[PDB]
Design a protein around this ligand. Structure first.
Ligand SMILES: [Zn+2]
Lengths: 84, 50, 58, 154, 62
RNA sequence: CUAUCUAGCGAAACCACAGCCAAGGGAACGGGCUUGGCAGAAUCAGCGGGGAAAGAAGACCCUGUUGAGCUUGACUCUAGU
RNA sequence: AGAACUGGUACGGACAAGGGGAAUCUGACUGUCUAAUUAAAACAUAGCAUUGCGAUGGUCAGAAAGUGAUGUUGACGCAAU
RNA sequence: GUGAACAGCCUCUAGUUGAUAGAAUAAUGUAGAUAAGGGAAGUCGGCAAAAUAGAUCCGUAACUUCGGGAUAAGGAUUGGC
RNA sequence: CGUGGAGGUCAGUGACGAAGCCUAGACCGUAAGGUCGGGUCGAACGGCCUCUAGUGCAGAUCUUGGUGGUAGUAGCAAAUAUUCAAAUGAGAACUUUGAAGACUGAAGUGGGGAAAGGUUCCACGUCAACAGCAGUUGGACGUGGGUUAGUCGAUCCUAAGA
RNA sequence: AUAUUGGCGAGAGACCGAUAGCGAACAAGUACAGUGAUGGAAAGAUGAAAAGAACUUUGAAAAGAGAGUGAAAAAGUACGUGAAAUUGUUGAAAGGGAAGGGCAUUUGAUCAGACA
């Protein structure tokens, strides 16, 4: 049977977790993630996946550092002691 | 499985600590829209694909 | 040699036992309402098979 | 607590209500319709005979394809049945109405059941799994029940 | 009450299985406070619990 | 073991409105129209004549200035050599 | 292995457990395939024959390359029918 | 234990005794059996079912690549003491 | 005729009840439609001259949502099989114990494990939902506890290969 | 001088007004499906204020009936108003193998108008 039986022989993964996006996309017979070529330096992105370019792009996360630069520019990238 | 990794175990631990209800004192706040926990998960219904 | 229980932990943080019960009941109810809704709103296009073979020609 | 259309006074009458009950609308309706207009004492005596499988309940509207019997003759019909969940859930509101009355000060010897109506309630839903990899509903038909007793005057 | 876990512990203690164990039916209240395994040991020697005898498989006709 | 009766639980297909016939005419084979025959609540188990029964915007045939798989000494070109 | 005796002639006492024969068509055989309508006389097979090639090579590949399969090979071989 | 046998059948250790139930025994069905006399007349067609079935002894043809065919066919026996 | 919005106007209506909604109650208009009374309800809405459009649905195997008849119907029928008493409890065909009967019958309905699952393990409490009947039971719900390695394995080696 | 459907900050609209307008007015690229690439939703409103129904009583318990809060429970967290299909109870009426409709009138129900 090509169905209800042959869904029974499904117990070994062709995918596991990428260390750069954290989802089950790391093909392991070949070692490349399918949503961001991990060994590759560039993140996988194509301009036909314009939805995918919202689920991963800037603004999605914390923006630990980049959230503060408009605050720092406004003040002129000043430094030193706050004030009296 | 039994002979597992640590990444997996760590994620399972997270999913455990997530598998609790909503604390009732949340519901008494002054502007609250949260009635229950909708990100709830149990091994019968939904498998976490890790 | 024991003092603490979750009940004594939640006594201070607002809800007492009867309010825990009365909260759980409505919490469960609002969890079940949405299930009734999800089943209704899926029931149409759950049985929609992409490649059903229709074992009948003669 | 807004009730249906009762052509009788609230002073000489008591009330009861059950909501979101998990019993079948169709079989509770026929049960209630079998005791409308009756005396309580001759109703509770009758719903207990039902469960003892004497003095059945007639099925007049929701009666298709069911079977015939001999305890329909005192109601004329031939299709009747003995629904012992409808019965219990009704019998437990008669008790409540009698109590409400006895605490309002009404004499339980001349009380009759004036208004009684069953409604449909929201369905509580599930799935049954049919052939060829499909799904179909398998859901209940709950019932609101609403009841009124009043004491017969001239 | 519900002495299923008591029956489990009793088998585990005695060695025999869950089916060669006999808990006295007149002593449910006292068995139920056997929330432990060191209590079962007290009960086996008080006789409230019993290791029933092997069912017999004779070999004489053979 | 079912079906059947009962307690409980309880879907689906399908559905213009619907549901007695004959002949007539009619989109040439009516459940409805016309003329007649007839006609009495509510109904249970079966049945498989019928509802040109249900399933599927016929698959055969044809048309389309719609395509595809394949072949060749068809037209126009091409990797390679 | 044998002999008596014996029974309602029963006795591989339940279970288990080959129907047989004469002929024709076809494929040699064992084997393989259409997972979910075709297990077949089709495919494969050994066996027979033919073709190319002596390495600067035959067949094949690759967008290309200081690139590759056969080839850890060498005609009693590799490749194609 | 039977038996050639990890077959089937029964049992010990261990485990379960769960599968929605009750009552009744109509048609038509699903699954399993029997059948007088005849014995494939049925039917596209012996489809289905039946018969044979184990072990021991005897006896075993045409044809043959001499290896087989072959459990050929075809007969008898089978317990208990 | 009508709808959503715009500019002017009635120094327009209105919490002493706007809009909306129900009304086999009334009036006008051929008609599209407009107006009134009653009940309900609770905050904004209209007539007129003009502007402007995402402007009027019975239909499209229309889209989404919802609800019906059929229907308390088909039907919950493989897996040999259940029964008595008691305890618990609001309540027991189904929970627990005991007694009986029976099954798997060691290529098992036993005892462990690899993949996989992920806390389903164990206890205490509990029944609204789930267990296509029931449920005092539970792989459910709620709260918590729980996995101890110099010797088992990974770790190390290399195969096809990358 | 020019470009700028991205980012940061500002101002506005003869625009949509929760099946609309961004897919997302809400814990939305969330839940969920799929091996994976990718796909991808639903879901806003109690009231001015929780004052969120003390207390009594029947019940095993949910809940009910009384009480009570409130301007209003015809606002009781299933909460703004709360349409229709569909459904229950009551009341009226009719009803031989359909129902419904058009003209005309009887009978019944209702409305009319005072012309004081
Ligand atoms: Zn990745």
């Amino acid at each position: 049977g090509k169905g209800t039986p042959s869904f029974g022989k499904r117990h070994n993964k062709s995918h596991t977790l990428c260390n750069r996006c954290g989802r089950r996309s790391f093909h392991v017979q070949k070692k490349t993630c399918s949503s961001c070529g991990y060994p590759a330096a560039k993140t996988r992105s194509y301009n036909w996946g314009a939805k995918a370019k919202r689920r991963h792009t800037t603004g999605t996360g914390r923006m630990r550092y980049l959230k503060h630069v408009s605050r720092r520019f406004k003040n002129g990238f000043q430094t030193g002691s706050a004030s009296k | 499985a039994a002979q597992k990794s640590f990444r997996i175990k760590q994620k399972m631990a997270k999913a455990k600590k997530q598998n609790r209800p909503l604390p009732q004192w949340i519901r008494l706040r002054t502007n609250n829209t949260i009635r229950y926990n909708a990100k709830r998960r149990n091994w019968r219904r939904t498998k976490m694909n890790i | 040699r024991r003092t603490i229980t979750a009940a004594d932990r939640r006594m201070v943080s607002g809800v007492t036992e009867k309010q825990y019960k009365k909260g759980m009941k409505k919490m469960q109810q609002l969890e079940k309402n949405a299930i009734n809704t999800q089943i209704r709103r899926e029931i149409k296009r759950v049985n929609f098979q992409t490649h059903y073979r229709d074992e009948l020609l003669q | 607590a807004r009730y249906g259309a009762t052509s009788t006074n609230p002073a000489k009458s008591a009330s009861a209500r059950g909501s979101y009950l998990r019993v079948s609308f169709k079989n509770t309706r026929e049960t209630a319709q079998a005791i409308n207009g009756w005396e309580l004492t001759k109703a509770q005596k009758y719903l207990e005979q039902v469960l003892d499988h004497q003095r059945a309940i007639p099925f007049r509207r929701f009666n298709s394809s069911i079977g015939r019997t001999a305890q329909g003759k005192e109601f004329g019909v031939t299709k009747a049945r003995w629904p012992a969940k409808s019965v219990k859930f009704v019998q437990g509101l008669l008790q409540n109405a009698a109590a409400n009355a006895e605490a309002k000060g009404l004499d339980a010897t001349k009380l009759y059941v004036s208004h009684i109506q069953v409604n449909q309630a929201p369905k509580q839903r599930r799935r049954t799994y049919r052939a060829h990899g499909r799904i179909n509903k398998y859901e209940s038909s709950p019932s609101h029940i609403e009841l009124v007793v009043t004491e017969k005057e001239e | 009450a519900n002495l299923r876990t008591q029956k489990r512990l009793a088998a585990s203690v005695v060695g025999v299985g869950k089916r060669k164990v006999w808990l006295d039916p007149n002593e449910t209240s006292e068995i139920a406070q056997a929330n432990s395994r060191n209590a079962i040991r007290k009960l086996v020697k008080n006789g409230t619990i019993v290791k029933k005898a092997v069912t017999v498989h004779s070999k004489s006709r053979t």
